[PDB]
Amino acid sequence: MTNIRKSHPLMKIVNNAFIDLPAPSNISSWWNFGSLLGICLILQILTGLFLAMHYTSDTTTAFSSVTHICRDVNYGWIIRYMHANGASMFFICLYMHVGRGLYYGSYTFLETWNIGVILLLTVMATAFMGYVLPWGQMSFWGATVITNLLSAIPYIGTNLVEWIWGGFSVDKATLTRFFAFHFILPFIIMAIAMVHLLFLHETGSNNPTGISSDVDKIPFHPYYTIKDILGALLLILALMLLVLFAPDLLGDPDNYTPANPLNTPPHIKPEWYFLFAYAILRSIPNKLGGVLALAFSILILALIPLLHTSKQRSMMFRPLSQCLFWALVADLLTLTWIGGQPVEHPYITIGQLASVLYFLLILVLMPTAGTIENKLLKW
Amino acid sequence: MTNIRKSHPLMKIVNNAFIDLPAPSNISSWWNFGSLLGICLILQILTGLFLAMHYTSDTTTAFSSVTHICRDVNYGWIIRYMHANGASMFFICLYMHVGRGLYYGSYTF
């Protein structure tokens, strides 16, 4: 070759994973969440760096600082609310991503699914720490209750919770730590995302039908670059629709109250992206049992590849699993509802059944349904 | 190939630039500054992140903050003086790097 810009620079060749790569033809709109997922990481990042251009990480100021970012600083208001709302998007998008590989057998790519899982739980920590930075009532108490949930571990726990906090409570110590970790996790995450993409570039993307598309492969550049741009268009639409017309709507917490350590919102709860886990945690009487169960809710994901029973990696051609699949999402929705509910009889009893129904759907129902379907097809 | 760990994972192959790579025989001690260069980048970072685990970025406090890292915080003193001094090294190393490039014409690249 001569003057083929792409392969000339070795570096520029590496970028032809966007332009020349084999892309399946058929391909639901669902896939656009991978790309969108990465737009969200970049958005969050630029926003973060501008917010962290005018934020301070101290008990005294933090609150003020954020409050100053939204009032005297020029266009810091949208930057901050874009930031907050963004993260909602980032999660909404992540849970579409996981649903699509729960449905279509994308998780077949073991390697790629274990990086995903790492990705998902990294992004979870970042969102947990970033919400406390502001240092508002909700934040303050939420980080106490969660962190302390770690003190359920029998031998260490207790010592360990105090290490993490850098003291006996959540004072300055802890709030600067979160600022530092929040800032450096998304930069570590970016390398994982690229390691994720790496593996996934070795086998290409699955499809609705669940079958190899090597017989029908499209250039990513011509087609997918427009689709992606279009998906951004809608993505930003939702971000701005949220951030411009209903700033607070999706940010349940109304606690714009500076944290007072004796004071408590009797209604303490993580934002929407964590509710599922929360509800599953309350269903167990015992503290430790809850924490394990909390972990398993999320960590349960890596086990699905082993759980797969069918011969059709595609759910598309399998009724019964489509039916339980959907239920689990609606069970998931049910559990998110419990998260903002008084922890009283009515919700208790519901949540408990929901929590068992979630684990059933993942651990026992679906697996069986997989077999059945195989035996109906005579497979 | 089968069970050649290295090229099995594609990822782990990318790491064989360290182990398997063609490296010239003859080679002054000067080239160790590349590697050390990275060493310093990694040390500053680990150090930075811990200092920025107890530092505040305001007029009022910043001086205090550093002062507090070097006094009340456990092993914060070395971390900070390791971070300051490091950066010296980091530069001392950098300027060896560029010297070598200047002298042997590595800059042809």
Partner: peptide, 26 residues
């Protein structure tokens, strides 16, 4: 070498004499 080095970097987070000063003193 590694053991102390690592240990120092973790105690750096454990609990600052600043805070710990007030601990247990009421």
């Amino acid at each position: 070498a590694a053991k102390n080095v690592v240990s120092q970097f973790v105690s750096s987070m454990s609990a600052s004499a600043d805070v710990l000063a007030m601990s247990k003193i009421e």
